[PDB]
Design a protein around this ligand. Structure first.
Ligand SMILES: Nc1ncnc2c1ncn2[C@@H]1O[C@H](COP(=O)(O)OP(=O)(O)OP(=O)(O)O)[C@@H](O)[C@H]1O
Lengths: 55, 441, 103
């Protein structure tokens, strides 16, 4: 759970997402197929999201 | 319905604590007799040039001798020109040595008489070194004029300028941290890396205790709208802020349900001076008790509900409450910790070192729940797992003097003095580059 | 009766005590006691103040409660209809003082 801090495409692919909570933010490296599931949803700058890591 | 004010208890009221005089004139001469008994090189007079309270004393003690405002007043009927706390705030021709709103001295005809009162009440009948504080990133003309008043008017062996918050850092036995000091004129944030201030990237917020007092005066001027029969001085509003304001932990939930009727009798703080149950404006101005019947000891009252948590909140949300177009304290601290210090070459660990000791120095800090708000803000900004430990100094308004007291007679201070012939040769704006003072020019 | 007050005014004085250490050769200059604008004009440090760029939560400026909507006539944030009534019937010369206290 948490608020998106940045949407940074690293390679030119892998896109880091910082998930800010009320206890601290945390970097997160995404697969280039889970990002095409984030991107179908309309997540832009500071939307709170709920990423399942496993499924 | 008579229920909401039938079983309501009688009020517990607090009087006005206006900054009046106090009946003391000591000509203390017992300090020079102890100062002339010590060996040379270990005697120096330390003056904290504070904007709210200039302090002065000798370095071999723990408490300062003189703690006066920079108030002077001169007039005539024989000419009286006394200064300091001897002014009663019943004649006031008061003008201050500091410019109103900024800790940069630009009223030198007042500062000369304030230093005159200091050297008289310490005892000078005749040449000691001077360690003196200043503000961060001081203007060169002010330092030139202060050095000219020290050498030419009085006659001194040497003086050295320093930042008082960094002296309180050096007395608190820290090595590397993020000194956040909320003073009377401005709130500084200074990162310190191995006993050295990184003054190329320190940030001052332009808010302070004087701004607290003036903004509290404006909100009590606009709250009591139809005319309040009473003299609304700035200093009595400052003493209201000193003992009736606290930084709230979770602000947007505390604020919106603050003026509810159920329990307003314990939130409200009331101040003397020498239908209605539906509207909130009666609860906002007057309280859950009924209206003022225009009595003697009823019209001359000031009620405080929102001003307890609205005025000390401007340090964190400045652009909305008071319209100062700058950033909050949490956002400045996060900008320095997360975006500048990892991008600076020459230092090893940006989160693992500066977060070991974040402590709070200045006088505008002794509010209930102020360190916890900053700790929750930095916990919301920093990555998970950083060992954050925010604390405060031991003697927050007096450690700025004690830090320069302990520093005054060491080898680094001896290698940073400016003697009289160095002032005669190098000029006026000469800077011994010490790790506490400003950058050399 | 006022002799004690007169003695308190007399003993609290600077000219009553002779200046045994002030240098009489020094003379003060007239071009002092300036402002920050004048000193910054002399030198043309103290430009380390930084603004912000973020959404601000706008509160009321009559009371301190959170207020979500303003006015066209006077541009005041206000909480509910009692504060709107007191805004629309306030005497002139104060509706600018609320924006002066806000900025
Ligand atoms: N017990 C207290 N609770 C809250 N605030 C207090 C308390 N005691 C003092 N203060 C505040 O501390 C402020 C004085 O701070 P201080 O005189 O140490 O600043 P300063 O060192 O003169 O500032 P500068 O270094 O800019 O000159 C006053 O505004 C006062 O409101």
């Amino acid at each position: 759970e948490g608020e998106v801090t940045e949407m940074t495409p690293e390679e030119a692919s892998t896109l880091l997402i910082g998930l800010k909570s009320a206890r601290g933010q945390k970097k997160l490296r995404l697969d280039p197929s889970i990002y095409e599931a984030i991107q179908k949803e309309r997540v832009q700058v500071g939307d709170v999201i709920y990423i399942e890591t496993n499924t | 319905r008579d229920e909401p004010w039938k079983r309501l208890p009688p009020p517990t009221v607090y009087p006005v604590k206006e900054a009046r005089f106090e009946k003391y004139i000591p000509p203390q001469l017992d300090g020079r007799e102890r100062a002339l008994a010590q060996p040379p090189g270990q005697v120096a007079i330390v003056i904290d040039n504070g904007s709210h309270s200039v302090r002065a004393g000798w370095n071999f003690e723990d408490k300062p001798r003189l703690a006066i405002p920079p108030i002077m007043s001169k007039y005539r009927d024989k000419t009286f020109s006394f200064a300091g706390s001897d002014c009663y705030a019943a004649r006031s021709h008061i003008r201050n040595a500091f410019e109103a709103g900024t800790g940069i001295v630009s009223n030198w005809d007042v500062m000369e008489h304030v230093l005159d009162y200091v050297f008289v009440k310490l005892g000078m009948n005749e040449d000691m070194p001077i360690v003196m504080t200043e503000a961060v990133a001081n203007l060169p003309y002010s330092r030139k004029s202060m050095s000219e008043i020290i050498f030419e008017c009085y006659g001194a062996p040497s003086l050295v300028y320093g930042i008082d918050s960094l002296f309180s850092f050096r007395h608190n036995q820290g090595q590397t941290g993020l000194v956040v000091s909320s003073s009377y004129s401005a709130t500084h944030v200074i990162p310190v890396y191995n006993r050295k201030a990184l003054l190329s990237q320190a940030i001052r917020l332009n808010w302070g205790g004087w701004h607290m007092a003036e903004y509290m005066l404006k909100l009590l001027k606009l709250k009591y709208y139809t005319g309040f029969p009473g003299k609304l001085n700035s200093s009595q509003t400052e003493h209201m802020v000193r003992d009736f304001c606290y930084v709230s932990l979770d602000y947007d939930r505390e604020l919106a349900g603050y003026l509810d009727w159920t329990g307003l009798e314990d939130r409200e703080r009331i101040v003397q001076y020498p239908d209605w149950s539906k509207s909130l404006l009666h609860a906002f101005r007057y309280g859950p008790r009924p209206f003022d019947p225009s009595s003697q000891a009823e019209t001359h009252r000031v009620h405080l509900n929102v001003e307890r948590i609205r005025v000390p909140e401007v340090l964190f949300q400045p652009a909305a409450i008071a319209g100062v177009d700058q950033a909050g304290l949490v956002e400045i601290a996060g900008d320095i910790l997360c975006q500048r210090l990892p991008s600076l070459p020459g230092i090893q660990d940006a989160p693992d070192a500066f977060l070991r000791d974040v402590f709070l120095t200045g006088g505008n800090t002794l509010f209930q729940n102020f360190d916890e708000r900053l700790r929750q803000g930095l916990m919301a900004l920093l990555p998970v797992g950083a060992p954050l430990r925010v604390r405060r100094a031991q003697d927050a308004i007096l450690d700025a003097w004690r830090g320069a007291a302990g520093w005054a007679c060491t080898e680094e201070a001896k290698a940073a003095w400016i003697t009289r012939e160095e002032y005669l040769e190098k000029g006026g704006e000469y800077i011994k580059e010490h790790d506490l003072g400003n950058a050399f020019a | 009766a006022q002799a004690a007050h007169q003695a308190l005014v007399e003993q609290l004085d600077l000219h009553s005590i002779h200046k045994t250490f002030r240098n009489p050769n020094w003379r003060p200059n007239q071009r002092r006691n300036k402002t920050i604008k004048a000193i910054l004009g002399e030198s043309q440090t103290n430009i380390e103040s930084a603004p912000s760029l973020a959404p601000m939560k706008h509160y009321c400026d009559v009371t301190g409660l959170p207020a979500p909507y303003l006015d066209p006539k006077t541009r005041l944030r206000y909480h509910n209809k009692e504060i709107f009534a007191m805004i629309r019937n306030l005497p002139q010369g104060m509706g600018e003082q609320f924006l002066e206290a806000r900025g």
